[PDB]
Amino acid sequence: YRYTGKLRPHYPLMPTRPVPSYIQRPDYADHPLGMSESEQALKGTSQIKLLSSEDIEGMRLVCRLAREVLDVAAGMIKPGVTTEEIDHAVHLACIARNCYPSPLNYYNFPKSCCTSVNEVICHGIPDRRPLQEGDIVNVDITLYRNGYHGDLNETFFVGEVDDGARKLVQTTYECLMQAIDAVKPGVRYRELGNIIQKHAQANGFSVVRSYCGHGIHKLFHTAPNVPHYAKNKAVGVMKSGHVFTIEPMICEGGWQDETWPDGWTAVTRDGKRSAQFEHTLLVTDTGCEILTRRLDSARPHFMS
Ligand SMILES: CO[C@@H](C(=O)NCC(N)=O)[C@H](O)[C@@H](O)[C@H](O)/C=C/C(C)(C)C
Ligand SMILES: [Mn+2]
Ligand SMILES: [Mn+2]
Ligand code: NA
Numbered sequence: 469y470r471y472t473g474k475l476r477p478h479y480p481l482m483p484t485r486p487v488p489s490y491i492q493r494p495d496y497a498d499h500p501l502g503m504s505e506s507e508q509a510l511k512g513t514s515q516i517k518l519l520s521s522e523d524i525e526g527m528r529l530v531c532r533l534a535r536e537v538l539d540v541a542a543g544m545i546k547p548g549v550t551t552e553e554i555d556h557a558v559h560l561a562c563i564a565r566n567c568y569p570s571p572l573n574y575y576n577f578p579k580s581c582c583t584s585v586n587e588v589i590c591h592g593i594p595d596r597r598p599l600q601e602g603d604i605v606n607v608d609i610t611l612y613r614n615g616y617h618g619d620l621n622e623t624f625f626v627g628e629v630d631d632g633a634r635k636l637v638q639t640t641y642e643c644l645m646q647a648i649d650a651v652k653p654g655v656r657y658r659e660l661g662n663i664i665q666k667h668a669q670a671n672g673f674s675v676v677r678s679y680c681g682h683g684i685h686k687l688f689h690t691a692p693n694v695p696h697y698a699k700n701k702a703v704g705v706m707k708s709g710h711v712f713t714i715e716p717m718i719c720e721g722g723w724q725d726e727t728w729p730d731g732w733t734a735v736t737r738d739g740k741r742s743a744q745f746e747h748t749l750l751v752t753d754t755g756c757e758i759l760t761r762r763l764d765s766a767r768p769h770f771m772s
Pocket of ligand 2: 619
């Protein structure tokens with residue numbers, strides 16, 4: 469394998485962490501390949517669920533607990549902390565909230581969250597690498613409570629970063645927020661990619677095509693598919709009651725990705741940096757409710 473940049477995996481990984489059996493588990497948790505039979509049963513469908521009141525309440529709770537766990541991870545971001553150490557804290561913070569960490573064994577993903585540094589676009593596997601001053605690192609958290617998943621991520625700076633890191637991260641967060649600002653009933657899912665690509669291209673960045681936002685509720689990934697690039701052909705129109713994520717991945721270089729031999733870590737094929745942000749959204753009559761927002765602070769962590 470020819471690495472595309474300076475990052476390397478740092479092995480061995482710690483043994484898989486158990487979740488106590490008192491925590492309710494999603495269907496894939498005990499499937500030997502991590503497959504989710506409830507997702508597979510819906511595979512080739514474009515139909516979108518209209519959430520009940522009870523469903524909305526379940527989504528509000530799990531998304532609120534997921535933001536609390538991202539904040540725990542945010543507080544740990546400093547030089548010399550390993551991504552494994554972050555994952556261990558996240559795994560304990562999920563169990564403290566009586567939640568299962570949704571990534572753990574999802575299609576055999578081996579950890580409780582994803583930690584993506586620099587050229588990693590997404591799905592990086594927490595490991596023994598200590599964070600370096602100048603890194604950008606994204607932590608992506610998903611929790612499962614009472615049958616509902618809630619998903620969010622932010623990119624953080626490790627100590628002092630360079631101007632290019634600051635622009636990429638800011639522009640990425642602005643792409644997510646301009647897309648959220650357009651959400652309201654009657655809007656097509658395919659329009660959000662136009663908004664995102666327009667702002668990314670104005671700042672000299674590209675938009676990852678291989679990875680997308682998604683419906684989420686009782687399934688971790690379900691309709692709709694939500695591409696982040698322009699002129700995509702995604703199916704569907706927003707309606708009040710729909711819940712989905714928007715999670716754009718924006719890159720310094722070209723948009724092309726490839727995956728490491730571990731089968732999960734997605735990296736820029738040019739080795740340049742990529743950043744991401746994610747929220748879980750509910751469509752409401754006035755626009756949308758950002759279920760994974762912060763409640764006690766105005767800005768994402770990178771701005772403090
Ligand atoms: C971009 O990643 C998203 C995704 O795969 N989107 C669907 C798609 N087909 O591109 C995904 O939802 C992430 O947000 C989630 O945190 C990570 C989940 C794993 C347990 C699969 C690593
Ligand atoms: Mn996520
Ligand atoms: Mn997601
Ligand atoms: Na990255």
